UniProtKB/TrEMBL annotation, chain B:
It comes from the Bacteria. Keywords: Amino-acid biosynthesis, Histidine biosynthesis, Hydrolase, Methionine biosynthesis, Multifunctional enzyme, NADP, Nucleotide-binding, One-carbon metabolism, Oxidoreductase, Purine biosynthesis. Its EC number is 1.5.1.5, 3.5.4.9. Pathway: One-carbon metabolism; tetrahydrofolate interconversion. Belongs to the tetrahydrofolate dehydrogenase/cyclohydrolase family. One of its GO terms (biological process) is L-histidine biosynthetic process. This is Bifunctional protein FolD. The gene is folD. It comes from Acinetobacter baumannii (strain ATCC 19606 / DSM 30007 / JCM 6841 / CCUG 19606 / CIP 70.34 / NBRC 109757 / NCIMB 12457 / NCTC 12156 / 81).
Amino acid sequence: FQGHMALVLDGRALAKQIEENLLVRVEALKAKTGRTPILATILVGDDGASATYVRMKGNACRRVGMDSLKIELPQETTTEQLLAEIEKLNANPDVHGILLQHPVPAQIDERACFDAISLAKDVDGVTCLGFGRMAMGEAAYGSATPAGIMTILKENNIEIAGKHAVVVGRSAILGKPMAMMLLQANATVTICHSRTQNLPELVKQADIIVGAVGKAELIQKDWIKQGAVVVDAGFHPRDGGGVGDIQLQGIEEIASAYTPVPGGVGPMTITTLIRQTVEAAEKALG
Amino acid sequence: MALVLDGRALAKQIEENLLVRVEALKAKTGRTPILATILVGDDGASATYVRMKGNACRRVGMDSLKIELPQETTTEQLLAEIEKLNANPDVHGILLQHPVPAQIDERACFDAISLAKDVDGVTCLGFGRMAMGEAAYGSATPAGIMTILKENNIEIAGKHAVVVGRSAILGKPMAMMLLQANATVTICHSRTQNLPELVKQADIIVGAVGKAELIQKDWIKQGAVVVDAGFHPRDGGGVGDIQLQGIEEIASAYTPVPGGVGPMTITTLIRQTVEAAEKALG
Ligand SMILES: [Cl-]
Ligand SMILES: [Cl-]
Ligand SMILES: [Cl-]
Ligand SMILES: [Cl-]
Ligand SMILES: [Cl-]
């Protein structure tokens, strides 16, 4: 019975492992050039979850020997003001990557602002250009969460080619890039959303299921195919352990492998961002 | 029983008001809209397609700038030509006819076309913009298919669409356009297992494989909407990527081959050129 239980896809462990390599790379770069890699983080407004995510990302920068430039803008910031701040960061040669923490206050055209980030500094992978390049096999930083997921799958030797992957959710920065990344890895990919009919049946057809709906435990455990690889990209704070977008209680009897929540996708989102920032700094300072 | 999704008729209809628009623009500005067409090398089908596209331009009162480059053209040479066209204020749209000779990095060359002139919808930036709901010219073939479906009042929202093929200029944009129209979308390709199974569940099936009659009639769901984007010339009538002989007994609606998707590929390109000229000149 112990042997037949699902493989835990341990994002926490993998993130720590990647960070050890990032640290030596950053220290080498600092020694050679005298300069520290910088991630600019932009936090617009007062959302508590956003503030926490930015704090965690800054901490990850420092863990690998980098630092962050913390830009904090008021909740009433306009699109025009945010664009101007991004252009300042684009023009600053000391800034290697730019993170705009989503979701910005809703009066701002978030897409316009994402698209203003220069490709070379798009270390969270949010630009339309970056998405298009990735979708067509050209070099670009990938959207952090789905790229982190691909890394988890590859480093745990999960078979993707020829498998049926079902991505539930189609957001610009998660579901859509996830789908394109899985397609590039030769999965057959189905993309579902709030207007999908027969969702339970489509999920049951999936060899690989990605929950990206932002609704706690929406994906039911009885929809999961026996032996499926289960990736839960959600996080919803709860007293006594947060939960994701998938019912994971007892998942170890159903899945061949799964990402826990917490400790699965979350750490790899942060670490992917920081890795792409190290790559951007290595390029800029070389 | 099937509705014939008549691309020829729709193209003709659309060209009527494109001609009105172009004649109004010429009268106002004294300038003729120009599509630059780039034919690289000796492929016969490519030459035919480019001529058809130039003819369509002329039917709606525009003109073409015919660029013909040799089979042995290099990536560098083609990029240089595209950059000349980008900076030529007399050129409003640029078409690079696919597939270019194998030694050329076609994707690099597509991506060199300026967004404002990307009237065939081939750039990575244009694809990404489209996929995220931002304004951009759409890849001509899939955008034409969307127009056919919409003009024929085909229900897309909530339907299970299956796109067989994932090319950068056809299957991938087709998938994203159907997704924006609120279809659930499955994208299949040469590594798909159980393709017949998946096709059988398609409410909307798009054949985008470039292999004659690969998609079998027996795989088609009763009542499906069947879109065949293939064309393979044959004596006494070309065929597409789907077996369509007898399709009228199965499909609720289908695109014939020829006369379905093909005319609408051309029309979409010309429409987007009219749009580009109106923006540049108006
Ligand atoms: Cl707010
Ligand atoms: Cl792909
Ligand atoms: Cl011509
Ligand atoms: Cl004619
Ligand atoms: Cl969409």
